[PDB]
Amino acid sequence: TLHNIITDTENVQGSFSKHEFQAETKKLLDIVARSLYSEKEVFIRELISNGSDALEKLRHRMITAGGDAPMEIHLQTDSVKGTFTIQDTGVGMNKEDLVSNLGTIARSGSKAFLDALQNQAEASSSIIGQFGVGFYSAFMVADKVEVYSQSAEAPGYKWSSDGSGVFEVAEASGVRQGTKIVLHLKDDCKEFSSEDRVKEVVTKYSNFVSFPIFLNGRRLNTLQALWMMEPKDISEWQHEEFYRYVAQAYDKPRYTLHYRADAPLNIRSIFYVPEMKPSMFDSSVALYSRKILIQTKATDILPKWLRFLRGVVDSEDIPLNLSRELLQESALIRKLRDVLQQRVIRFLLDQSKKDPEKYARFFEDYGLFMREGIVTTGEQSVKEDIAKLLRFESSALPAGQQTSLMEYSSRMKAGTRNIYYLCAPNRHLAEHSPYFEAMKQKDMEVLFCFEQFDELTLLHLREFDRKKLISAERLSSEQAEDLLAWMRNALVQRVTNIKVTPLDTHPAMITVLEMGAARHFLRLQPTLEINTGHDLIKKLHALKDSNPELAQLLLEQIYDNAMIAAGLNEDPRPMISRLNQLLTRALE
Amino acid sequence: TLHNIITDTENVQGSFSKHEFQAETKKLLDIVARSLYSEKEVFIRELISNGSDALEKLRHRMITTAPMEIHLQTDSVKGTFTIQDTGVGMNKEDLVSNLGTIARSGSKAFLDSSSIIGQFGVGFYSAFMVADKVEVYSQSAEADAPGYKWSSDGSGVFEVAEASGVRQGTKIVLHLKDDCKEFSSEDRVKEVVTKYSNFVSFPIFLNGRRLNTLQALWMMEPKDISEWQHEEFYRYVAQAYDKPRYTLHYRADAPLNIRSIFYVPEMKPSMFDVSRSVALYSRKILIQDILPKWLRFLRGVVDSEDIPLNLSRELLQESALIRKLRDVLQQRVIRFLLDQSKKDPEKYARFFEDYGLFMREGIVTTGEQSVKEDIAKLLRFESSALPAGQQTSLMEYSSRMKAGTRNIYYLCAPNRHLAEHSPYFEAMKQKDMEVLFCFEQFDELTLLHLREFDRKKLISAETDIVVDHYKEEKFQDSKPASERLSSEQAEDLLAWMRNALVQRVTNIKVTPRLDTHPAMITVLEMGAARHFLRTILQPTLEINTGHDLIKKLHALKDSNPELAQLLLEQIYDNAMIAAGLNEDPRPMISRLNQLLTRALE
Ligand SMILES: Nc1ncnc2c1ncn2[C@@H]1O[C@H](COP(=O)(O)OP(=O)(O)NP(=O)(O)O)[C@@H](O)[C@H]1O
Ligand SMILES: Nc1ncnc2c1ncn2[C@@H]1O[C@H](COP(=O)(O)OP(=O)(O)NP(=O)(O)O)[C@@H](O)[C@H]1O
Ligand SMILES: [Co+2]
Ligand SMILES: [Co+2]
Ligand SMILES: [Co+2]
Ligand SMILES: [Co+2]
Ligand SMILES: [Mg+2]
Ligand SMILES: [Mg+2]
């Protein structure tokens, strides 16, 4: 029932030829200029990266062979002629370098320059170019490209091409030191001769480029890359400002984490938690490399549950896809994500100590993210890492006070290893749980979990600290029996039981067996319990025969009042008209 | 004030030299091997695509019998991945010029149909992502013609020799590097095929077993798809176990080529997943928004030939075409859902109940008014002019509006009975306008954001009641003056209430607009106040001096003054709750029980 035709039936017969791999130059240029980037606008990123690199090499040269000029990138638009022009005052290119570097695809002068530096040299970490293709991005948007270049050594040149397999080189006066590139834009790309549009692209990708960038004689990039600076030389106001820019936000960060490290990758990063809680009516952490935008929404570097963080991650040696808008599959990027997960958890844990009050607000607003993380990850070790961030209330603690799974594990009786919880809409329904009343008597402490999805979190948690979480789950004696028998008939299809109990000020209360049910209800088999010493109950007893119609309203009210006190009816609008009838008739 | 450096100053001196662009081949190979594809597994897709193309070329040549299939083999002991197709094969010139030359694609000069996948001339080199060594055995058809072995380590050179025992077609053997042993696992290779190549037009066999490849339903004639084929296909694309309640199979050629199928699940959406969905294809191979956020409940697939692919085959290439496509799809889906409401309103009611929250979200988070209104066409309400239970729409409301009218009135209450008997509705009934009844939690927020519809302002009943004070209060009471407090009694009572409720209310007023209710709370921007409470104000308390409870209060203030104050506090609380402006109701229960006992003697 198997069908395979793969068989070792081949044998080397005779002699063989040796060939070198070739490359169809014509088609390859078309591929860069058409089939490489998701957006045409990206040619501006590339040309500015080149200007930065040229400037960086000049700066490097002058450390040793010092000499004389300012280091700048200038952009000019001409909306009448349809041109885009960029000029840098960097190292420039002689005729040999124009032909070699521009004329040859995947040849990178910058890459060779990098490979020859001491790894410690500043330029080692700021040179952007790697592949030797970014320049061809100009043909995506231009029918004609002209390059004027003057090297810093001992004649100016003009390089020229339409990008169709050929190019021309001639001597030129009077070219300024560095390189000037003029793009004659295609008709469908004339938008890049608009100043406003070019400004949008520069700020998107290249806002943190190290050298001043001018557009039509005006400076743009006034924003310094805070993530590359020493964490201590940065003030709270700089973070507030930088946060707003990077998160496109208008509030401040409640938390700031400035993380720098060298392994598995170079990392310079800043993470923020917004002060404003998120909701339905609605950026992410951005990825950079050597100060250039890679992805506005970084995908592989953080786990999904940490998507509430804003900010930036920059790595010098993260493996980039050729398009420079994706990362390659890498064991190093996987390790980075794991490292960051642990760092952020560690940071939030520290914060729960420094200010439990503040952390309490944070957990109310963002705790859902932690719960999601515990449910969706498949690593038990990490589930218990994220679980250190959870807060609940406890049977063994007062109302409104939070504790962690660790603090519970702390207080446990020495001879036991079970974590008991009870997921309830509220505390009243918890304290009066049949299942919890059990754990009151013989057993001891139970976690009260009121938040949404607290349940399946713990179900998915399964195991914490090698331990197991498991859900713990007046009126005479015949005047009352008469009253009860009456009550069961007026509330036939509302409750599945009516009891009598020792309540004080409250004439009745609602209790529920399954908390699980009550959630379906709020999305039920209540048990009303009557205080036969309460005046309204004794009044109810008297009116059931004397004024049956009045006692019907009163009964309904006592039931509704009990459901409200149990948090089982949060919006009492349905009762108001009846209640008003009860009041008018009572007040005759 | 300006700093520029760019000046038209440069002039050419003497003649030019002419040059041809060149390529650094060795470094291109490295780029294809390490930097081109973001995921290693796609070498499987690329090799299958080549096999599929070779088979298409043979099919086209066989017109003008033999099997046409693709075989995969994993050897986890030898660390080897093998693929063999029964296609046209390659001759010596072909092995050299097409395989040996990066960016050379024989699958171009073949033209000359739309079944051919290969375009760039680089896909084959993806093998070097995962393999130290690659051997190729190919046999052309017919044509003369010898067999050949092609061989390379991936760096720089390769060798070809004539060979025997080469079956018609092409076999390729990947000697996997230690980094990539996962591709000698059958379960692993199977995962990849079904991910990218599950709609390939020829059978694929893995280690002798035929893979369950599928029909590209979206490309096919809609009328030839049975409900059951859609059920199955839905379950596949949505990875679900239930079936679709709606199926939209959309083809178009203008303005954009589009072949798509969308499904709405029969299941209600998980509330967990809502806070925490359509695949994109080209030529039957997977490609990795397209729908606006509010339509993320839809499942299914979109294919469009106007979307260009990047070199790596994982990104789309015109962020403006996409916005267009998305706008087209949004429009088509709204029209589809409007049509479903016509055909079967009862079934649509269930849909709206389960998914309505997505519409409301869409209305609230869009900035474009015409889009808010388009989505708003999907909303359903009840009406004061229709029997209980009968759903209607903004459009139908608009069509009943008299010539003079210029506003759409609405009232938000938990249910039909509460709206019909709302004090706000009693007040509105004195006018002759139709009032929409909206029962869902975020309906008010939604209409607040919607603001207007078809040039008609949306106004809540509660708001309209306040505005009428600043016009003519030309309304007469429901009860004759005999059944009301005299003015002197009304003024006396009000002055008392103002003292008893000093810092809780802005003012207190009688109103002729109530019947069943003793009082109501009014706030100009009621809706916005309700929304704000979900985490005081300048509320007005308006009393009905014809109501038994109000008149009794007038008496009580002079007979049991303490009881009168307790009554007063409760009336205010009742009006706040009825207004939807109440804080936690639990702490009022104490007062209420106390009030209840003192009343009952
Ligand atoms: N503005 C410039 N000034 C001086 N030299 C330049 C300039 N632009 C490009 N070059 C040179 O031309 C080469 C080719 O540029 P490019 O095609 O962008 O490849 P790359 O910058 O080297 N690497 P990549 O950007 O990752 O593809 C560079 O490496 C430099 O040697
Ligand atoms: N299995 C095969 N059988 C026959 N010819 C093949 C086979 N694989 C590759 N070829 C030939 O070799 C050429 C190069 O393949 P490839 O590098 O994948 O580029 P491409 O398929 O043409 N376009 P693309 O896949 O989009 O990069 C193809 O165009 C075919 O002419
Ligand atoms: Co052999
Ligand atoms: Co070195
Ligand atoms: Co000139
Ligand atoms: Co009309
Ligand atoms: Mg470059
Ligand atoms: Mg191919």
mmCIF file of N, CA and C in Angstrom, chain A residues 58-99:
data_model
loop_
_atom_site.group_PDB
_atom_site.id
_atom_site.type_symbol
_atom_site.label_atom_id
_atom_site.label_comp_id
_atom_site.label_asym_id
_atom_site.label_seq_id
_atom_site.Cartn_x
_atom_site.Cartn_y
_atom_site.Cartn_z
ATOM 1 N N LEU A 58 34.857 58.652 7.393
ATOM 2 C CA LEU A 58 35.664 59.856 7.377
ATOM 3 C C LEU A 58 36.061 60.157 8.798
ATOM 4 N N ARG A 59 35.106 59.995 9.710
ATOM 5 C CA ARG A 59 35.392 60.290 11.099
ATOM 6 C C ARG A 59 36.477 59.333 11.560
ATOM 7 N N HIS A 60 36.373 58.054 11.197
ATOM 8 C CA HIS A 60 37.410 57.076 11.571
ATOM 9 C C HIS A 60 38.816 57.434 11.037
ATOM 10 N N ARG A 61 38.886 57.888 9.783
ATOM 11 C CA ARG A 61 40.159 58.259 9.161
ATOM 12 C C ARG A 61 40.823 59.373 9.915
ATOM 13 N N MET A 62 40.024 60.343 10.327
ATOM 14 C CA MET A 62 40.564 61.501 10.994
ATOM 15 C C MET A 62 41.014 61.268 12.449
ATOM 16 N N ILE A 63 40.734 60.095 13.017
ATOM 17 C CA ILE A 63 41.289 59.772 14.330
ATOM 18 C C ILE A 63 42.800 59.661 14.198
ATOM 19 N N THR A 64 43.232 59.014 13.120
ATOM 20 C CA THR A 64 44.655 58.790 12.932
ATOM 21 C C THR A 64 45.266 59.799 11.960
ATOM 22 N N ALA A 65 44.804 59.814 10.721
ATOM 23 C CA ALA A 65 45.359 60.721 9.740
ATOM 24 C C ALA A 65 44.524 61.981 9.793
ATOM 25 N N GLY A 66 44.563 62.634 10.951
ATOM 26 C CA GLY A 66 43.763 63.812 11.211
ATOM 27 C C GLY A 66 43.880 64.811 10.097
ATOM 28 N N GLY A 67 42.870 65.660 9.960
ATOM 29 C CA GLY A 67 42.891 66.684 8.937
ATOM 30 C C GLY A 67 41.887 67.774 9.226
ATOM 31 N N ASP A 68 41.344 68.352 8.159
ATOM 32 C CA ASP A 68 40.386 69.447 8.260
ATOM 33 C C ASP A 68 38.977 68.904 8.474
ATOM 34 N N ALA A 69 35.957 69.703 7.977
ATOM 35 C CA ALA A 69 34.669 70.005 7.370
ATOM 36 C C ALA A 69 33.533 69.339 8.175
ATOM 37 N N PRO A 70 32.330 69.938 8.168
ATOM 38 C CA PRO A 70 31.229 69.411 8.985
ATOM 39 C C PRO A 70 30.630 68.134 8.401
ATOM 40 N N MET A 71 30.029 67.320 9.259
ATOM 41 C CA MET A 71 29.598 65.986 8.888
ATOM 42 C C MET A 71 28.077 65.963 8.862
ATOM 43 N N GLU A 72 27.524 65.978 7.653
ATOM 44 C CA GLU A 72 26.107 66.242 7.472
ATOM 45 C C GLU A 72 25.563 65.481 6.273
ATOM 46 N N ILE A 73 24.263 65.216 6.327
ATOM 47 C CA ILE A 73 23.502 64.622 5.240
ATOM 48 C C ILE A 73 22.451 65.681 4.849
ATOM 49 N N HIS A 74 22.439 66.045 3.566
ATOM 50 C CA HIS A 74 21.458 66.988 3.032
ATOM 51 C C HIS A 74 20.551 66.332 2.002
ATOM 52 N N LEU A 75 19.260 66.609 2.136
ATOM 53 C CA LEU A 75 18.264 66.130 1.199
ATOM 54 C C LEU A 75 17.624 67.347 0.532
ATOM 55 N N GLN A 76 17.377 67.251 -0.771
ATOM 56 C CA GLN A 76 16.658 68.298 -1.469
ATOM 57 C C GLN A 76 15.584 67.709 -2.382
ATOM 58 N N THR A 77 14.395 68.311 -2.340
ATOM 59 C CA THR A 77 13.317 67.920 -3.243
ATOM 60 C C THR A 77 13.070 69.012 -4.284
ATOM 61 N N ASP A 78 12.705 68.597 -5.495
ATOM 62 C CA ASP A 78 12.310 69.551 -6.526
ATOM 63 C C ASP A 78 11.018 69.010 -7.154
ATOM 64 N N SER A 79 9.897 69.607 -6.767
ATOM 65 C CA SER A 79 8.587 69.111 -7.156
ATOM 66 C C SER A 79 8.195 69.533 -8.574
ATOM 67 N N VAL A 80 8.996 70.403 -9.196
ATOM 68 C CA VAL A 80 8.748 70.817 -10.579
ATOM 69 C C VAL A 80 9.466 69.879 -11.536
ATOM 70 N N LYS A 81 10.697 69.524 -11.185
ATOM 71 C CA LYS A 81 11.503 68.654 -12.026
ATOM 72 C C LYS A 81 11.311 67.202 -11.645
ATOM 73 N N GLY A 82 10.752 66.969 -10.461
ATOM 74 C CA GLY A 82 10.507 65.613 -9.993
ATOM 75 C C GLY A 82 11.763 64.898 -9.547
ATOM 76 N N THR A 83 12.629 65.589 -8.813
ATOM 77 C CA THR A 83 13.877 64.966 -8.408
ATOM 78 C C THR A 83 14.015 64.848 -6.909
ATOM 79 N N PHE A 84 14.797 63.860 -6.497
ATOM 80 C CA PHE A 84 15.148 63.703 -5.100
ATOM 81 C C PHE A 84 16.668 63.685 -5.098
ATOM 82 N N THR A 85 17.250 64.512 -4.247
ATOM 83 C CA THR A 85 18.698 64.638 -4.179
ATOM 84 C C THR A 85 19.198 64.445 -2.737
ATOM 85 N N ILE A 86 20.245 63.640 -2.566
ATOM 86 C CA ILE A 86 20.877 63.507 -1.249
ATOM 87 C C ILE A 86 22.379 63.721 -1.350
ATOM 88 N N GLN A 87 22.931 64.501 -0.433
ATOM 89 C CA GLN A 87 24.366 64.757 -0.437
ATOM 90 C C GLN A 87 24.953 64.585 0.974
ATOM 91 N N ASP A 88 26.074 63.870 1.079
ATOM 92 C CA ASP A 88 26.762 63.741 2.364
ATOM 93 C C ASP A 88 28.168 64.321 2.218
ATOM 94 N N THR A 89 28.764 64.776 3.317
ATOM 95 C CA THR A 89 30.117 65.349 3.264
ATOM 96 C C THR A 89 31.111 64.323 3.820
ATOM 97 N N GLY A 90 30.822 63.049 3.546
ATOM 98 C CA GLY A 90 31.655 61.957 4.005
ATOM 99 C C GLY A 90 32.853 61.688 3.112
ATOM 100 N N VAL A 91 33.314 60.450 3.141
ATOM 101 C CA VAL A 91 34.601 60.090 2.582
ATOM 102 C C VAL A 91 34.673 60.120 1.044
ATOM 103 N N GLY A 92 33.529 60.042 0.364
ATOM 104 C CA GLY A 92 33.518 60.147 -1.092
ATOM 105 C C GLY A 92 34.110 58.925 -1.780
ATOM 106 N N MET A 93 34.230 58.974 -3.111
ATOM 107 C CA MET A 93 34.614 57.803 -3.914
ATOM 108 C C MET A 93 35.437 58.269 -5.114
ATOM 109 N N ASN A 94 36.614 57.677 -5.312
ATOM 110 C CA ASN A 94 37.386 57.911 -6.532
ATOM 111 C C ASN A 94 36.815 57.055 -7.663
ATOM 112 N N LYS A 95 37.385 57.161 -8.865
ATOM 113 C CA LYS A 95 36.841 56.438 -10.012
ATOM 114 C C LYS A 95 36.826 54.925 -9.803
ATOM 115 N N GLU A 96 37.911 54.403 -9.244
ATOM 116 C CA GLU A 96 38.022 52.975 -8.970
ATOM 117 C C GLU A 96 36.917 52.508 -8.022
ATOM 118 N N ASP A 97 36.644 53.318 -7.005
ATOM 119 C CA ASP A 97 35.682 52.957 -5.979
ATOM 120 C C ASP A 97 34.255 53.081 -6.476
ATOM 121 N N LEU A 98 34.010 54.018 -7.392
ATOM 122 C CA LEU A 98 32.688 54.142 -8.011
ATOM 123 C C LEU A 98 32.389 52.911 -8.842
ATOM 124 N N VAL A 99 33.359 52.503 -9.661
ATOM 125 C CA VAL A 99 33.173 51.357 -10.552
ATOM 126 C C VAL A 99 33.034 50.053 -9.758
#
